[PDB]
């Protein structure tokens with residue numbers, strides 16, 4: 001259990017439950033049997049996390065030359081990597097080539113020009129819109145034609161809705177659109193056999209739109225537009241789905257201020273594990289490592305002199321005391337400063 | 350010259366060109382506009398080695414806010430006396446490190462901190478920081494705080510405050526200083542040896558600031574005369590951060606990808622998850638600057654710059670008129686030395 005790694009043992013530290021990942025996978029292979037997962041390394045590049053996912057037979061979605069170097073470092077073969085970054089730096093595209101990574105994405109003619117000059121025989125996937133990335137459908141015909149003139153081996157379509165979804169229809173529409181563009185590619189003599197549904201899948205039960213109400217809507221549309229076919233290969237770039245809940249952060253209360261409301265200061269914040277409050281819209285919940293009081297409105301703060309380095313605003317907590325620990329669960333996604341300790345629960349040695 | 354030694358090694362990873370001389374000039378201007386105030390450089394702003402060494406040689410003091418910043422400053426030969434542990438709420442093991450390093454001046458703004466101090470660093474010269482939400486004791490609670498410090502046998506040596514850089518009006522400095530006199534007297538009244546006044550930081554580092562440094566030094570010197578007339582027993586200091594380094598750093602990024610629509614979008618190999626974290630953390634508004642001097646009646650078009658990351662939030666510029674650029678061409682960003690720093694850094698002196 002995690003619930004007692006921590007309870008077994010003042011710098012902040014991470015407790016990572018690898019077993020929670022293995023469970024996330026099983027649930028994936030179940031709710032989306034047709035979709036092969038390519039883990040968005042950017043979400044959490046922890047070594048054990050990558051190795052664990054590797055062993056589970058997963059693929060990796062690298063978006064930079066370093067992520068590729070990292071994945072290739074743990075023995076993962078090039079074939080299992082997708083350089084899913086649309087606009088890539090030439091020296092990088094060059095690194096991918098030299099590393100055996102032949103699948104990359106793109107969303108504009110320009111990228112194709114760079115590819116033609118640097119990685120000609122690269123299997124290219126056309127990412128479509130669902131602001132910064134994704135070619136509009138209307139411009140796809142023109143793009144493909146140009147890829148034709150550039151002798152680019154276009155092997156599929158991809159998209160990404162993101163995690164800010166309230167409604168799963170977005171997945172249905174993006175997939176319908178993918179068929180449309182898929183046909184054009186096939187129409188222009190392009191060998192279209194890959195469908196990338198991206199990421200944005202809930203890593204917690206915390207969020208209203210369940211993973212499973214999503215897999216459902218996806219499988220439906222995936223049946224109405226991409227019926228089974230041995231030539232076809234469907235993948236996704238899940239990031240937070242696999243690691244959000246696997247990480248639990250333990251911070252130590254370093255200073256207090258009373259006034260009846262409290263103000264606690266912990267040794268980690270926005271300039272660290274909590275950069276996710278500013279970068280990823282994260283809303284966290286402080287959780288005492290103490291057994292359950294009169295509760296009072298509180299606020300937690302990072303150890304930094306920056307008045308913006310605030311972790312919690314107004315959360316009811318029991319009166320805490322300097323030196324006592326505070327926990328934050330669901331801190332594995334876009335958070336990794338805290339050493340990392342792993343735990344493998346409910347699993348057959 | 351920068352404007353040209355950049356226009357030397359561009360003979361495509363991003364790099365910093367730091368003009369140390371711009372720092373030496375910043376100092377002279379300080380010793381001139383604020384002769385009575387000794388500067389303690391807020392290391393947090395930019396901890397570059399040459400920057401610290403340069404400031405050291407210029408006979409400046411250092412405002413460290415953590416155990417590492419102290420270790421760093423102590424590392425370049427700077428003596429403990431020239432350091433002020435200006436972080437109000439400090440982690441005990443840290444307070445312990447300061448002690449062991451000879452750093453005896455620290456700040457505080459609540460009784461609590463005093464308790465920690467009494468148990469860990471008794472003979473520490475403590476500076477009470479006042480309000481100008483996260484830091485700064487209100488004046489109304491200062492009497493009570495001092496009394497408690499008395500009961501704790503704390504050697505309270507002064508007052509401090511911080512208005513920050515979000516100032517439109519310098520009066521704030523005048524009021525904070527008036528308030529500092531008031532609390533200064535109480536300390537003296539309770540038998541406390543009050544002989545230090547810390548005016549904090551928040552002084553312009555760029556010539557783009559509405560509020561001039563010099564209209565500020567003026568208002569400060571005025572109030573400093575009406576409340577803290579010269580006195581050999583008195584010592585006045587400040588914690589300037591951005592003033593000394595903002596304009597000394599010039600960032601060079603390489604355009605790695607492009608897209609058209611008449612408007613343009615550019616992708617560079619650095620952004621919010623790096624040197625540009627200042628757009629999210631420090632309210633920075635940057636200006637892209639071609640490294641290809643201009644030509645004529647050039648046609649300029651609305652553009653946008655973007656970080657190399659898959660994050661749609663990794664946007665550097667929104668809508669800025671620039672000439673049509675081309676992948677492989679450089680883009681410059683000036684005034685990027687404050688709260689921005691591994692793009693390799695290059696130094697011009």
Ligand SMILES: CN[C@@H]1[C@@H](O)[C@@H](O[C@@H]2[C@@H](O)[C@H](O[C@H]3O[C@H]([C@H](C)O)[C@@H](O)[C@H](O)[C@H]3N)[C@@H](N)C[C@H]2N)OC[C@]1(C)O
Nearest residue numbers: 002003004007204205206287288289290291327329330
């Ligand atoms: C909506 N957020 C959910 C929520 O259901 C949450 O449950 C926590 C639960 O974990 C806490 O219980 C905690 O107790 C101990 C800790 C040392 O005190 C640990 O074992 C562990 O953190 C947890 N079991 C409980 N005290 C409050 C609920 N909100 O569990 C995780 C979550 C998915 O983020």
Ligand SMILES: CN[C@@H]1[C@@H](O)[C@@H](O[C@@H]2[C@@H](O)[C@H](O[C@H]3O[C@H]([C@H](C)O)[C@@H](O)[C@H](O)[C@H]3N)[C@@H](N)C[C@H]2N)OC[C@]1(C)O
Nearest residue numbers: 351352353355356555556557636639640641642683684
């Ligand atoms: C917006 N920053 C202001 C600004 O006045 C700036 O001067 C720039 C000047 O640096 C630029 O001129 C630039 O010229 C070349 C580049 C090839 O064009 C660069 O190599 C060089 O660093 C720079 N001097 C000029 N194009 C506009 C002015 N506003 O100087 C710094 C500053 C005062 O903070």
Ligand SMILES: Cc1ncc(COP(=O)(O)O)c(CN[C@H](CCCN)C(=O)O)c1O
Nearest residue numbers: 040199200201237238239240279280659661
């Ligand atoms: C090509 C691509 N593939 C997978 C994922 C993974 O998303 P998720 O982890 O939700 O499944 C992302 C998410 N990148 C940032 C995330 C913002 C981070 N601060 C976003 O703005 O969605 C992406 O751009």
Ligand SMILES: Cc1ncc(COP(=O)(O)O)c(CN[C@H](CCCN)C(=O)O)c1O
Nearest residue numbers: 305391513550551552588589590591630631
């Ligand atoms: C006690 C203390 N003394 C000096 C400085 C230096 O400020 P400046 O460099 O402007 O002079 C700081 C910087 N704190 C954040 C900075 C926010 C960083 N994004 C702020 O709100 O200005 C501080 O907390």
